[PDB]
Design a protein around this ligand. Structure first.
Ligand code: MG
Ligand code: MG
Ligand code: MG
Ligand code: MG
Ligand code: MG
Ligand code: MG
Ligand code: MG
Ligand code: MG
Ligand code: MG
Ligand code: MG
Ligand code: MG
Ligand code: MG
Ligand code: MG
Ligand code: MG
Ligand code: MG
Ligand code: MG
Ligand code: MG
Ligand code: MG
Ligand code: MG
Ligand code: MG
Ligand code: MG
Ligand code: MG
Ligand code: MG
Ligand code: MG
Ligand code: MG
Lengths: 16, 244, 181, 170
RNA sequence: UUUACUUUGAAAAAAUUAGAGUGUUCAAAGCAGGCGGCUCGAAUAUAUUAGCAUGGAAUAAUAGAAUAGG
RNA sequence: UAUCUGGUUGAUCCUGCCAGUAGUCAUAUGCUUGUCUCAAAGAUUAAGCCAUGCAUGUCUAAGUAUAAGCAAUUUAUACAGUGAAACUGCGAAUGGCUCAUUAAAUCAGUUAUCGUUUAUUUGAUAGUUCCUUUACUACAUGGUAUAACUGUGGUAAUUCUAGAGCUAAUACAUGCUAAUCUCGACCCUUUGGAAGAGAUGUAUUUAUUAGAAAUGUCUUCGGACUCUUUGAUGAUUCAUAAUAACUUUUCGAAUCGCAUGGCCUUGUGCUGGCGAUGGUUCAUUCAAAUUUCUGCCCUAUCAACUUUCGAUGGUAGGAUAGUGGCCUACCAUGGUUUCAACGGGUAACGGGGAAUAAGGGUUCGAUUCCGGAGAGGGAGCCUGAGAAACGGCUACCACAUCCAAGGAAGGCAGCAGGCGCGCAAAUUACCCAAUCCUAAUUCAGGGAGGUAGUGACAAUAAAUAACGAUACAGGGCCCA
């Protein structure tokens, strides 16, 4: 039987 | 000493755990349980150093006592519980199921499985004997005593156990041509098929195994675990299929 | 207790240090490349001796043996990457032909001198130790830094340095303030 | 005081070993329990582990089995007649395994008449010497239990070649 | 024929040693995973003697109801 | 040794010789000591002696609170929040330190337990209906009982305790409550009903017993008709089962939290969920004890040793968890040795390892990991699954603290810090945040451990400057 298939991203903010 | 030891130095811990030598002075000492000390992975190591879900011992304790971790279909709260080979670990909150199988390197690998696969496990028949009241029973490699076995089930065979109820669904005989997995020695983690069981009276039996690449190697019988017939394993195998 | 942290010496005293030829050779090397003291020459001689002994031992082995192929390929790759060994020069026998000088040019101080950022090896060292030179995005203050071929052509003045774009140093602005006053 | 370790003894070659370590609890020994005929006195002993041992300081009664008919009856112990290890135990009437003792003939006899209706005939036939013992009123028995361990004086009756040899020794 | 002897395979903890990869700012070190299937990655080695299994024609011992008798 | 320098005469060459120049490591010591990373701390063969302080305690919803404890409330009607103290349970047998003793001993590798104990973890595992005083507690038995606590007291003094009064349990001691299964005549022909003949735990000890031409007929074409009937190991008196008795003889839940579902004949009736803690036996796991074979430095100016008081082996017994001269009684005369027994020395814990070496070799290895032994020196023990424990106890020897002289209290080869001299060397520092460990347990505890401080132990990198112009002068450098 086959194994289970494989399966939050970076976010950016600039201030000042 | 005068009694059982309760500490384990990091340098003395099993190598396959991959514990940093400089991180501390002591390593988790596996508590008593189904599997032997050297052939077991305590839950703390699995949750922290492998899955990286917890950052130190204390969040591991928090996770465990939240009852989010199930081993062998049962909730465990001991941080040093000795999970071992072919033990099913379920984290329902994450919807993740793992089966503990060594990689070709010989190290317990994070192998994700489906729920249907998680419903059953495999156990090598370590003993078959008549108990009290004349009730036959089988002892598997994980210390499970299953009563009223199928009388064909013999030592060195493997039995498929349903986790929910703990009965034998099916079994595989130890014969030439079956598919086996190495659970000890330098060949640890390799997968192959039997060619001969070489037998020595009063001595350790030796088994010759041929892999898919036709390479042949010899290992002691205690280190052999039947997992199916050739081309049809009863469990999902890790990446590489135990080659090299 | 905590597990030991291993260590090793990076240099060894030559066999008979006081040879006049050896003294003059160390003099020439130190003067040409601006080495602080003899320990640097001893260190690089130790490294080169280790490399060349390994090359000899591999050469002793027959052709096509697994260990010879694997170790020789690794050693040639490392020597080519660091820049001592040229691309057309990829054989262990030519590794036996290396000299300390090659590693000496591969020092960051020498590269800074040659690239024209500094006109002299000592000026180059002074620039390195004062945090004015950056390899890529990284400020390097170690003259013994070994420059790779790829890293060679990214050497520049650091953005924070007064020569690389930042504001003038303390001396310049102090003088400007006093002149204004 | 009593210890069993092989260390204090001389070596096979005759060399004498030096004291490797102090005495250990797990190689201990305890005083003998010289069981004697007298009112039942037994006291327990706390042994290694959670287990326990019984010390027969005194017993009169023991369970003796007539093998040839496959029965077992409780019977008073008359006295020690012969012991193969050391004869002072016979003199002092000390009860231990393999001691030869005398037991009452009463329950065995009554069972005999009850089952066989005789003081069928072929089955009732019994070896002559034991019939003489029945007529005497006391039977020779051999203790098969260890009164120093289990607190029992169970045994079995002598018969056949066993009986003949022990009578000859007597 | 048997042994000695020799080849090969298991076994000989970890740490240490040799070795592969990695811009800890360099280095002494530490370290095993990266991209969205990619045929990517410690590939690993190492131990005189004792025991176990195994292929051996020579060498050195050891054997014979050997070419015996009527 | 090499290389380098010098001496060997009236001088120069060529030889030959002599003196000095090699090396890391180790011990001691002198001077200097700015920055980053990292890391160690023995030594009088004195395992010699120690003031003071700390280093092992522990409570969840789930064993026991009328603390005359604290706070609460719909202002309390057995209790209910939180909770000192004490009982109870568990741990203290791990960890840390040191190398005194130890020369087939420890130890390394490799075997065996069909030779035995094993708390804990994990998986299984126990309806016995009935059996005269039913004159009957199971809608749940006692003090055959006490602490904490109230109160009266002794002693100079200690983690000293006497008498009296109280009260609990998962402490201690007792003790119960119309079942299941074989066949089954007769009806009925199945989803069948059942007149009745029968059978009924564990634990301990002994004895005995078991454990090894149906090639047909019919049939619906399927199927039915008769027979089988333990398993494992190389190997067993193995596993298991059975019969007869036996036992100062056990066990078979008189325990606790949360919650209030389902049936009705409407009764505080019957039934019922999720957990904790206990309990017999087996297996597994952590362990422990013995154990098979090979391997240790110097010594032969140690050649015979062991055996009277066990030395080798046989039988029986005692003892133990268990094998075994381990011990006892009786027996024989055995056992090792020039292939070095036995005795003596060892500044002898063994090993993984470290240094050197071209290779063979030689030396070191208290010291980060494993294993063994010890806690000033002998001897003996309670507890507990596990100790011959010493931050547990008792005696003796040597030391040594307090004293009212009547007595009491001792073990830093644990972390700091002292003495051992009249000559010297880390802080009586902070913390449980990391590592893991103990507990009733997320939470409390941990000089284990971590953080920082402190003689250049051993190692890595590396500052103390770089860039110009101007002026003046003719000698500077190498060989011989
Ligand atoms: Mg076996
Ligand atoms: Mg700056
Ligand atoms: Mg070998
Ligand atoms: Mg000084
Ligand atoms: Mg300065
Ligand atoms: Mg600074
Ligand atoms: Mg209250
Ligand atoms: Mg409460
Ligand atoms: Mg000696
Ligand atoms: Mg030996
Ligand atoms: Mg426990
Ligand atoms: Mg259990
Ligand atoms: Mg009272
Ligand atoms: Mg015996
Ligand atoms: Mg004797
Ligand atoms: Mg010594
Ligand atoms: Mg050592
Ligand atoms: Mg001790
Ligand atoms: Mg002392
Ligand atoms: Mg003691
Ligand atoms: Mg202690
Ligand atoms: Mg102390
Ligand atoms: Mg100290
Ligand atoms: Mg310290
Ligand atoms: Mg509880």
């Amino acid at each position: 039987p086959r194994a289970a298939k494989k399966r939050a991203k970076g976010k950016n903010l600039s201030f000042k | 000493a005068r009694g059982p030891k309760k500490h384990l130095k990091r340098l003395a811990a099993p190598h396959h755990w991959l514990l940093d030598k400089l991180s501390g002075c002591y390593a988790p000492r596996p508590s008593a349980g189904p599997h032997k000390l050297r052939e077991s992975l305590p839950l703390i190591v699995f949750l922290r150093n492998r899955l990286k879900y917890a950052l130190n011992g204390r969040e591991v304790k928090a996770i465990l006592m939240q009852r989010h971790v199930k081993v062998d279909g049962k909730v465990r709260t001991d941080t040093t519980y000795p999970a071992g080979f072919m033990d099913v670990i379920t984290l329902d909150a994450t919807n993740e199921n793992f089966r503990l199988v060594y990689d070709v390197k010989g190290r317990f690998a994070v192998h994700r499985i489906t729920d249907e696969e998680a419903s059953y496990k495999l156990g090598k028949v370590k003993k078959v004997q008549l108990g009290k009241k004349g009730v036959p029973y089988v002892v598997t490699h994980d210390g499970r005593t299953i009563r009223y076995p199928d009388p064909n089930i013999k030592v060195n065979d493997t039995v498929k156990i349903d986790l929910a109820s703990g009965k034998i669904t099916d079994f595989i005989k130890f014969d030439a041509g079956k598919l086996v997995y190495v659970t000890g020695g330098r060949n640890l983690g390799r997968i192959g098929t039997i060619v001969h069981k070489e037998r020595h009276d009063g001595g350790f039996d030796l088994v010759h195994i041929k892999d898919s690449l036709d390479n042949t190697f010899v290992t002691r019988l205690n280190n052999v675990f039947v997992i199916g017939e050739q081309g049809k394993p009863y469990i999902s195998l890790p990446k590489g299929k135990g080659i090299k | 207790p905590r597990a030991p942290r291993t260590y090793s010496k990076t240099y060894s005293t030559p066999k008979r240090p006081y040879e006049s030829s050896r003294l003059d050779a160390e003099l020439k090397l130190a003067g040409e490349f601006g080495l602080k003291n003899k320990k640097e020459i001893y260190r690089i001689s130790f490294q080169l001796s280790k490399i060349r002994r390994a090359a000899r031992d591999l050469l002793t082995r027959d052709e096509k043996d697994p260990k010879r192929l694997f170790e020789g390929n690794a050693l040639i790759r490392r020597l080519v990457r660091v820049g001592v060994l040229s691309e057309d020069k990829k054989k262990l026998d030519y590794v036996l032909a290396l000299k300390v000088e090659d590693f000496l040019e591969r020092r960051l101080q020498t590269q800074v001198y040659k690239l024209g950022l500094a006109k002299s090896v000592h000026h180059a060292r002074v620039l390195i130790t004062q945090r004015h030179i950056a390899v890529g995005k990284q400020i390097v203050n170690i003259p013994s830094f070994m420059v790779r071929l790829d890293s060679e052509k990214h050497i520049d003045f650091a953005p924070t340095s007064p020569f690389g774009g930042a504001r003038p140093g303390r001396v310049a602005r102090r003088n400007a303030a006093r002149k204004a006053e | 005081g009593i210890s069993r370790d092989s260390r204090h003894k001389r070596s096979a070659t005759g060399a004498k070993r030096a004291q490797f370590r102090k005495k250990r609890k797990f190689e201990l020994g305890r005083q003998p329990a010289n069981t004697k005929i007298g009112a039942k006195r037994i006291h327990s002993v706390r042994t290694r582990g959670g287990n326990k041992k019984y010390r027969a300081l005194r017993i009169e009664t023991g369970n003796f089995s007539w093998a040839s008919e496959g029965i077992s009856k409780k019977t008073r112990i008359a006295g020690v007649v012969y012991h193969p290890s050391n004869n002072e135990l016979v003199r002092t009437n000390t009860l231990t395994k393999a001691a030869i003792v005398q037991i009452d003939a009463t329950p065995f006899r009554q069972w005999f008449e009850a089952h066989y209706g005789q003081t069928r005939a072929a089955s009732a036939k019994i070896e002559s010497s034991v019939e003489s013992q029945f007529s005497a009123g006391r039977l020779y028995a051999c203790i098969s239990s260890r009164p120093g361990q289990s607190g029992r004086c169970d045994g079995y009756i002598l018969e056949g070649e066993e009986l003949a040899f022990y009578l000859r020794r007597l």
